[PDB]
């Protein structure tokens, strides 16, 4: 009974190998009280932190795919094994996911903590991008992975990765959430506290969408109330947003909205393809796969397809693959990979690590 753990910047997904959906999905936050208790637990992690966020200071242990606090990060894993999964980490092998082009030190710390603190019997680390292609059942294609901290574009051809062609974009859901605050203040709504950040994120996940034509949507939004929606705050107050529904996701295509010099997500995908060999660009154009919670916006695939089509040659046939469950493609692909018979040899035993160290982990992994 292997354990599949997919730890992201904002979301953490856990479950058991062979399962179709993760059993435990909780926010990757650590909350601490900011007031003084007067009536006769110094930290909260995950859902309990969200329920008590009114009196807690929410902090993300991972920022831009970088672990800013390993102590809080261990709380996430401890909460995952004992509170969420309610299983013993020492009795089940664990499969872990890492961001593309993961630094060697980051994997070592992840490797060390599993074997020494949780004393897991077996462990393996896999590329998040590869697992997404596993779920799609494809051996060739470029996968874009926009989550909470970092957006990545990884092309894979016939099971072979091209690290030189991997592109990274420092723009993801958290950045869009912060942008939503900045434009929401223009509507008179003030969201400043960390507790409101989850609220703003909730509005973004429910009312935001990608417009096929950004300028046209402004003209419609500036002359009609059809694009108007209402959201209810936890305190019963109802807020109303108009053009902000599709203005916030536009930053993915226009990073200049956030003042970023980098190019949009479509060009980054296009540039990643262009960095590959000429003979393999045929398949990558027709095998573009979307993964991550930041790809859940309605109409994002169609806007993806239109933008890349304008860049690619007219003879190029473009296919955008956006499975409905792509929010958990990394975890789902890991579950399938962990269930394969030809996967048992990838496992690394704790005894082997004790006698060899992290050197065996850098090899056998990509």
């Amino acid at each position: 009974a292997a354990l599949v753990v997919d730890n992201g910047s904002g979301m953490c997904k856990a479950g058991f190998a062979g399962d179709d959906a993760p059993r435990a999905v909780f926010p990757s936050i650590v909350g601490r009280p900011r007031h003084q208790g007067v009536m006769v637990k110094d930290s909260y992690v995950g859902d309990e932190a969200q329920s008590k966020r009114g009196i807690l200071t929410l902090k993300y242990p991972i920022e831009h795919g970088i672990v800013t606090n390993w102590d809080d990060m261990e709380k996430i894993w401890h909460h995952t094994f004992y509170n969420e999964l309610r299983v013993a980490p020492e009795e089940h092998p664990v499969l872990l996911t890492e961001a593309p082009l993961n630094p060697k030190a980051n994997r070592e710390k992840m490797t060390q903590i599993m074997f020494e603190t949780f004393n897991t019997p077996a462990m393996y680390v896999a590329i998040q991008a590869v697992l997404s292609l596993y779920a799609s059942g494809r051996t060739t294609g470029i996968v874009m992975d926009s989550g909470d901290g970092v957006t990545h574009t990884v092309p894979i051809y016939e099971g072979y990765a091209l690290p030189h062609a991997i592109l990274r974009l420092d723009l993801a859901g958290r950045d869009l959430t912060d942008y939503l605050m900045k434009i929401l203040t223009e509507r008179g709504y003030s969201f400043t506290t960390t507790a409101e950040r989850e609220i703003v994120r909730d509005i973004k996940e429910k009312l935001c969408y990608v417009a096929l034509d950004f300028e046209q949507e402004m003209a419609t939004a500036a002359s009609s109330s059809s694009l108007e929606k209402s959201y209810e705050l936890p305190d019963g107050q109802v807020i109303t947003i108009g053009n902000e529904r599709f203005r916030c996701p536009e930053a993915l295509f226009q990073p200049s909205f956030l003042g970023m010099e980098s190019a949009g997500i479509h060009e980054t995908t296009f540039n990643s393809i262009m960095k590959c060999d000429v003979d393999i660009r045929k398949d990558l154009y027709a095998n573009t796969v979307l993964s991550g919670g930041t790809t859940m916006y309605p109409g994002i695939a169609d806007r993806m397809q239109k933008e890349i089509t304008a860049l690619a040659p007219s003879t190029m046939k473009i296919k955008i693959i956006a499975p409905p469950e792509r929010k958990y493609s990394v975890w789902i692909g890991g579950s399938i990979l962990a269930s394969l018979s030809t996967f048992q040899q990838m496992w690394i035993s704790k005894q082997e690590y004790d006698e060899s160290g992290p050197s065996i982990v850098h090899r056998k992994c990509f």
């Binding site: 300028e215 304008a310 040659p313 007219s314």
Partner: protein, 393 residues
């Protein structure tokens, strides 16, 4: 009283959408400083780079988006094409001058080009050097002005393939540009000697001349105004780009003299007689500056500037007949990049959605006022004016 009275003080530029542009176009890489583009309300013509000889690409305005690299082109010149100009009285007729010291006039099919075009309607061989200046007569039909590098100005009757007039002993150095006056009776020329000359072609006499109009040695331009004045853009001794206004009756000092910047690149002016607004674009510049010319001093008022992040290689201006009158559009500019042509819309902000009579006075129509033989006799007539009210939708 606080604000100078004008209707165009808030005119803003807006590029068209990506799908409405033209990409995959190998623009010509000739150092000659010309417009590199000629557009009429039916077609768009752009000088392109050809491995052998010279050619320019002519495509319908509706054919937007990416352009096939094997698209047929007008490849008739044995040398690189220097400049192009549509016939005002025939949207299907365009004249071209190239480095092969010849001028060839073409007839484009109604639907565009299905096969590459090599044979022209009429070939004009009167210049000993490359011809980089061509100017159709605003009023007289089938009359074309050509000025090559041999400092010789020629008048051609394309209908009869006859050289109407020859002007040779009038320009001691290379000629920069030539512009007809309002009625077509006179034309102004800019020469390398920093001298602006107004010449009567039918008489071959120098009407007026201003020596050292701009003290800089960089190339400078000169155009005629509808009211009958001369707008010259040139450089100073300190290599600063300047704009000057001149009275043909008094050239001892310019009416106005404003300095824009110290940047390089020749300033190509684009005059709109209907609005009395001159758009000043510089080669390699990423911004377009437009000014209003009025009788009130200092006779040159800076309106505003549309700024882009990309330098342009050339510039083409859409005449009034092809503009979208219903959107309060007063000018359309086809910015040419190194591999893309991006149309730019010049729009007057107006609350009312109805037709704006003030913004759209009667404009010269596509019918010639006179003919070549009549104009040779000495007849003078103003261009026939049409109404843009019918274009409203």
């Amino acid at each position: 009283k606080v604000v100078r009275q004008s209707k165009f003080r808030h005119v803003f530029g807006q590029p068209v959408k990506n799908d409405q542009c033209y990409e995959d176009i190998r623009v010509s890489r000739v150092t000659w400083d010309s417009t590199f583009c000629a557009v009429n309300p039916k077609f768009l013509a752009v000088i392109v780079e050809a491995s052998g000889g010279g050619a320019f690409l002519v495509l319908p305005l509706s054919k937007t988006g990416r352009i096939d690299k094997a698209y047929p082109t007008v490849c008739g010149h044995t040398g690189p094409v220097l400049d192009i100009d549509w016939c005002p009285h025939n949207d299907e007729v365009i004249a071209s001058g190239s480095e092969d010291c010849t001028v060839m006039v073409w007839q484009i099919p109604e639907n565009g080009l299905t096969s590459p075009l090599t044979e022209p309607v009429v070939v004009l061989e009167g210049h000993t050097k490359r011809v980089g200046i061509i100017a159709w007569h605003p009023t007289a039909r089938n009359v074309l002005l050509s000025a090559g590098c041999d400092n010789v100005v020629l008048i051609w009757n394309v209908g009869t393939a006859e050289e109407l007039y020859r002007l040779d002993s009038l320009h001691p150095d290379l000629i920069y540009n030539v512009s007809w006056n309002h009625n077509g009776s006179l034309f102004c020329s800019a020469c390398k000697d920093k001298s602006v000359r107004i010449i009567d072609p039918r008489r071959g006499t120098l009407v007026a001349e201003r020596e050292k109009a701009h003290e800089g040695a960089r190339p400078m331009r000169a155009i005629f105004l509808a009211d009958g004045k001369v707008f010259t853009t040139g450089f100073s001794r300190m290599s600063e780009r300047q704009l000057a206004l001149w009275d043909p009756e008094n050239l001892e000092e310019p009416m106005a003299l404003q300095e824009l910047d110290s940047s390089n690149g020749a300033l190509l002016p684009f005059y709109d007689p209907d609005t009395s607004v001159v758009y000043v674009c510089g080669k390699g510049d990423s911004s377009i500056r437009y000014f209003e010319i009025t009788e009130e001093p200092p006779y040159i008022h800076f309106l505003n500037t549309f700024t882009s992040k990309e330098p342009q290689r050339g510039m083409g201006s859409m005449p009034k007949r092809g503009l979208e009158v219903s959107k309060c559009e007063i000018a359309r500019f086809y910015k040419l990049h190194e591999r893309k042509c991006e149309p730019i819309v010049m729009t007057v902000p107006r609350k009312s959605d109805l037709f704006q009579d003030d913004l759209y006075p009667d404009t010269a129509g596509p019918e010639a006022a006179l003919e070549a033989e009549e104009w040779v006799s000495g007849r003078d007539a103003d261009p026939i004016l049409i109404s843009l009210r019918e274009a409203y939708v």
